[PDB]
Every structure is written in structure tokens, then in C-alpha cells.
């Protein structure tokens, strides 16, 4: 994935009106999502 910050006990701000962490039933979703939507510049480990 590659979201914003991660809150103590929070998750990772998937992102929306002031926070928006994700459903640890899946939300990390994995199997799908992840940068590639910026492939040959994907550039990960930003900050």
C-alpha cells in the first residue's frame, strides 16, 4: 500500500475528511491496491 501516517493503534490513514483508517477485517485489502497507479515512478518509501 502506501498511505499517510499510522496512528498508535490506529492502522494507516487510508485517507478522507480528517483521518480514515481501515477495516482490519480486510482493509489493508492487500490483494489489489498498491502504487501501480504510478508504476515506472511508483516511488515507494517516500516519507
Amino acid at each position: 500500500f502506501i498511505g499517510t501516517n499510522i496512528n498508535k493503534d490506529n492502522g494507516i490513514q487510508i485517507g478522507t475528511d480528517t483521518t480514515n483508517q481501515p477495516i482490519y477485517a480486510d482493509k489493508t485489502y492487500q490483494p489489489e491496491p498498491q502504487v501501480g497507479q504510478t508504476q515506472w515512478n511508483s516511488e515507494v518509501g517516500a516519507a
Partner: protein, 878 residues
Amino acid sequence: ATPSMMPQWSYMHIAGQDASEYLSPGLVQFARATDTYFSLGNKFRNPTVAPTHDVTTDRSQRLTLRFVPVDREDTAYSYKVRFTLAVGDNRVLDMASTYFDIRGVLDRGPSFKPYSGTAYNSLAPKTAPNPCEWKDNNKIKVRGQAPFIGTNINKDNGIQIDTTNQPIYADKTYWNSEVGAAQKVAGRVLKDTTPMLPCYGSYAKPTNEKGGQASLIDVNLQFFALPSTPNEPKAVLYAENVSIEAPDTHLVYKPDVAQGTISSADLLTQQAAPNRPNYIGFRDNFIGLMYYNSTGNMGVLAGQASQLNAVVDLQDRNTELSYQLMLDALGDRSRYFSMWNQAVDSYDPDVRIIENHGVEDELPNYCFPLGGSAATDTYSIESGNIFAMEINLAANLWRSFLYSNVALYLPDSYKITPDNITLPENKNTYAYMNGRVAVPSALDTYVNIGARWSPDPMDNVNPFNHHRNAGLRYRSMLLGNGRYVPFHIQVPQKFFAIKNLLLLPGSYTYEWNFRKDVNMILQSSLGNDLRVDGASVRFDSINLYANFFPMAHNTASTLEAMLRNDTNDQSFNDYLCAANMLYPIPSNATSVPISIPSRNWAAFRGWSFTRLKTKETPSLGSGFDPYFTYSGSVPYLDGTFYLNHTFKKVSIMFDSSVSWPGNDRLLTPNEFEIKRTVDGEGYNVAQCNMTKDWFLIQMLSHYNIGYQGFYVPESYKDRMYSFFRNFQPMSRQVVNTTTYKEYQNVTLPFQHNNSGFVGYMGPTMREGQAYPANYPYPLIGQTAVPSLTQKKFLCDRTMWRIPFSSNFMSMGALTDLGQNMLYANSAHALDMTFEVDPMDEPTLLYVLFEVFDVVRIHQPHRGVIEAVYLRTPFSAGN
């Protein structure tokens, strides 16, 4: 059961009355009435009693008699076996079944390679630097590779594998995300005296029971380590001095500054490749081995104690192309028989009329690292998607198809030989036809994109020398996958007069000079001079073989005293009744003035044009005519007619005052036109460029419909060597050469569509910088250059017919206007002129003036064959 059993049989109609009989006459009518619905037919059995008496012998007659030569000579150009047929009494042979039984060795020359590609080290980067020892400035040695971890290395015994277990010498060769080689490594290097070839073809003979390469007269064990600490034993390499070779390779980028030397750093890079595949094998129905139709070396079937002759052979007919057509006209030649080696020549209909329809790629076809992920970090594990990598699979396969089947089968004009490797100069042996690379930008994926087009430059190459000559294929594999091959043939007998003769009782002799002229009795898949590059067919044993019908003596006596009466005599005809004659159209010529003076046309049932190329049409009948330097299909006696779509005109004209077209039938008055290249003002037919009266006139002769509307003739009337199956019509479009204002042409270097991604001009490698493109010109998109269309007429495996009849139909054997006193009583003189298209090199047209062949073999006494051999409309007599 009873000693007769007849009654006990009839009560099951097992052998008795037929159902039409025992069934009560009332029922039979009812069953014959309601038979198109609720049929009572398949339940009241009949019988099938076969003939008890007078059908079979009881006293003799091995079914398949074995005659042995009473003569044999090895002229190196023939093998004149002289058998002695002894068909007995009350006994008949029906000389169909009169095989020969050739047996001997055959040595296919250093040009034979069935594995269409590489069969040696195959899955490999065809740029691989075989682990070598790149010798040097007396600098002494260098690089390579390795992998058999081990732990301990002791001197003069390398890789430690109770005790240390101290490995053997010869044998050192052969993770998910692991390996990680710490704790010693080793391997086996190649010494700097072995020509360092690429990894795609390399092979050294075993020379070692335990597998490994080695020179038997071997090797030095040597060390090296890591600079990190260069005094402590690191990896150990068991190098060696192999017999490195590559018996399938035509290296295409030999770094060419290597004069004198063999191994050097500027030569680790050597893009190898597989030599173009030679299929090799015997000809369809053995059209060769059998000197048919060479009046000089011609057999005989004359009764013994007359020994005059019974097979009078002219030099006009070609009885080798009148068997390869009768097979078409009788069965289905597409079915492979093996005794006659029956395997029709062919051509993948997708690689002659190339349809570049397109690849089927939409999503990137992707690579993934061996185990799960790639290099990564260590923190609170990869960051982001895995390391990826791509191949458009659907495109590489298509490009391989194109410049593996079509794009390197082109004439040796669009084929720049590899960079500077040295070739021979005889561009006819397999030393110059596989050292020929084929630019991938002549034919490639972006070639006439989307339109069926046999690419123009290969229109004139013949189709049947190819990878996929399925029949070059089932004679090059049937015999064997080898340089050397024993073989055991069963050649048939094709002479029309001696191929169904019944041969009543007698003592007839039999002789027939076979051909030992390899390169004329041995086909190829690329065109060769097998005799020069190495080839030979040593005969060892010829034997006749006849199958007798075990006919009861008292009935064979009748059939032999009854087949001797004058009226009850045989009569035979060549299926291709013709008076074959070849005309020498010169190179780059558009004409063929022909002629024939003061003939007496009496049954001339119609011409048949064609057009062969010289090199590959054989020399007529002399013998070893050396000027034959082709190995491919022989359109003269192979049936394969490829240079047939090039005719433009025929101008038949009798006395010197006429036009057999006739009065005015022909649509363009009495000037038969087979092609209207640019002047199609209303007259060309299909979307081809044929002319509506040169179709109307073929589908009228060949099938038999032109006055009732063309209706895709019936299936059983277009057998292989016919017109319609081979009328493949085709068309393109091209950039208007003078309206697209910016058409600055771009030749075959200069061009650039794949950019870096693929070659530069060869079948080399990836060297570029991907800008956009510029050679495929857009004919298909919103920005499309204005287009001039062009048309073609691919039609091969058939002979243009032009029957001698008024209607131009086939209303009988003796044509209508082959019976008229205007032609059937007086004498005329034919003077034609064909206007064939400029070919380019020698090219003989193959007019096939048609006549009535016929023979009337008869055997009055016990052992006398006498037959008349008339051929009209072009006979033989003074």
C-alpha cells in the same frame, strides 16, 4: 449338427434366401412403401454366401512371388536390374502389384537437420559466454562462474562433500529466495585453448563415463579467491580442455576483430542461432528413382523369347506427373500412405498468403522474481509492489513465426549475410543458404498490417520448399532422423501401359534403370546441391514382387484363353494425355513466341499453360545433366506449380489468319486475357485481377459451370490439383506515393519501428533508445495517408486450362471442335504468343499441348506382348 446343415442354416437365413424372397409377398410391399418413415429394413437379415467353387486354387501359387535380378550393374548414375518375370499358367499377374524392393544405404550430407531450430543446449541466452578462460597478454587467464558450495577445500582435492568424503575429480556440475553462498563455492571452467563458442550450441563429446567433458590425452585444477582476504582458499574451479563444438549454429555477430586468435575478451559476445532447417527425404511417390521417360535409359517388358520390347517411351509425355495427378483424380492425396511414400507436397496456407491479422496482447505479460519478492529493507519486508518485468508474449511468438517461416525464406537479395563471418561463394550449397540472415524489418509484425498479402518479394519463390512442407516432413522423418540411413523402399510402377496390364501367362522379361542421381532423387526444404555439399544413395539390392490372385486353374484357363482373342484386348491411356513441350522464356522477357507448322489436329482436346523456373525444373532426360543444381520441388514432375500467377496474355492463332477463341466468343475479342493489371475499365472479375473471361473460361473447363451462374463447384470436383481450391484472391492498400505530401520514403536501414527494443539489422539483439517510429505508415487510423490499392492473383498447384471446344465446356473426351473437318480433315499450324510477366531469371514455360494417348497391349501366344502406342493430335510417325 447334420452332415449337411443347410436346413439348420436357412432357418436363420444365415445362408439362404434373401429377405425380398422369404418375406411373405404382402409384407415386402409394405416395407418397400413405408421406407422413408418407420423402415422395416434393418431387422430381417439376408445372407452373403460367397462363391464356393471355381474362385480359388488348391495346388500352388504363393501369393507374393519373389523374383530376383538376373542382372545388375553399378554405373553410379543408374542401376539396371534385369528381372525375369515368369507368370505361370492358369495364373495372371495384373501388373499393378509389381513393386520393386530397393534396399541400401543413404548418406544425407552435412546439410540435414530435421530439428527445425536447435536441439543442443537450447533454453539459453543466445549471447551466453560459455564459462571460458579468456587467455591473454601472457596476462594469463580470467573469469567464468560456479556453484557447488561445499565447505572444505584441500589442495589437489577441491570440494569437500567418518571422513571428509573428498570429492571425485571429473564430476562437478549441477534459492526460492535463499542460497546466499557463504562457506566456500566452486565450479568447472573452460581452459584457454578451447574455441569459446556461445552457450546455445556448445557440446563436447562425453569422453568420461561419469558424464563430464574431457580431452582423453587431462586437465589442471586451479584456484582463486576474493580480494577481501586473498590468502585463504576461496572457490576452486576444475577447468578443462573440452572438444567444444556446435553442430547447429551460424553465429551472427562474431566479434570480427579476432584474426588468428581464438579466445579473447572481445569475443565472449557471440549471438549464436539455429541453422535454417533442412528436411531431406525421398520424393512423393518416388518421382525420381525410376528413369521413366528417358528414351535412352528406358526399361522393357517384352516377352522373353522375343525380347523386342513392350514399353516404348517417348520424350514428350511425363509419366511422373501423370501418376501424381491420377492419384488426385482417384482418391484423396491429402491422406498419407507410406509404401509409395505417398505424401503430397504442401505449404502452410498461413505462411504463403501471410495474414498478419495481429497479436492478441492487451495487458502487459509480466515477469516476477523467483521467490515472492526482490531485494528489500529491514524495519518495524518489501516497500511497494514487487520488482517486475515484462514481455509482450503474443508479439514475440508472431515475430518468430514471421521471420522463421517467411521472412528468412526470401530470395537471396533481401538477405545481408552476418556482419563479417566468411561465407563460400557458391550461393547454392548449404554453406550460403544458412549463413544467410534475414533482416527482420523486411518481413515483420508491421507488414501490410491487417491485410492478407503474400509479401510481394516472395510471390515468385516457390511455396513447397519450407519448414512445413508436410510431405517434406513425412518423408524426412519417416526414413529417419539421421545423417546416415539404411532404407527399404517399395517404389511402384507408373508407366500407363505397364501399370495395369494383366500379363497373361508367359515368360516376360523386366528391366528398369533406377536413378542414383541424388539431388534429383532426394528433395530438400531450402534448395541445395546435395551432390556437392555431400550426399549419396548407395543401392544394395533390387527385387521384383508380384501378388498373384490364387485363381482356380480351370477358371484362369478360361480367362486366359478368353483374354487372348483379338477383341478381348486391353487398352490404356495416360491420365494426363498430353504432348509436353518446354519453351525457353529468357530472363527478364515479356513474351514467348511459340509455333508449330502444318499439323493435322485431329483430337486436340485443349491446351494447358504453365510456367516453371529453370534451375529447378530438371534437365529433360539425358542422364546426369550437371546443370541441375536444385533440391526442391520439381514443378516439371512434382505437380507443384508455384510460378503460375504471372501470366498476362495468350494469343492463339491458327493458319496465321484466325483466333481459336473463335468468332467472337471471347469477351475481349479473341485475345485471351488472364490479367488486367491497371486497365480494369469494367472488365476484371473477382476482386482479383483476373479478367472475367479468364475465369469464366477456367471454371468452365476445370469444374464445369459458367453459363448457369458460378456456384462454388461441388466438393468432389475440385480435388487437390484443381482450380478453385487454389484461387486464393488477395489485396492491399499502399501510401499514395505522391499525394501524401510528406511521404519521404524510408528504405530498410534508415526505418525504425521497435526502436531499441529489438534488432538494428539482423537477428541480433536489443540495442536502442525507443523513440516513437516511422515506417509503418498508418493506413488505418484517423490520420491515414491517402491510399492506392493494389491487387494480386496467387493461384498455384494448378495448370491454366483452355479447352479446345466451342462452348469451352467438357461435354466429352473427344471435344466437339476436335471432330470437325475444318480441323479434322485438313492441316493447320499453331502460332501463339504468351505475354508472361517479367520474372527475372531463366524461366521455361510449360505448354502442355494435349492429345489422346492410348495403348492396346495384347498377348496372343504364351509370352508375346505386342502393343500399339498412338498418340494423336501430335503423334509419332513418318
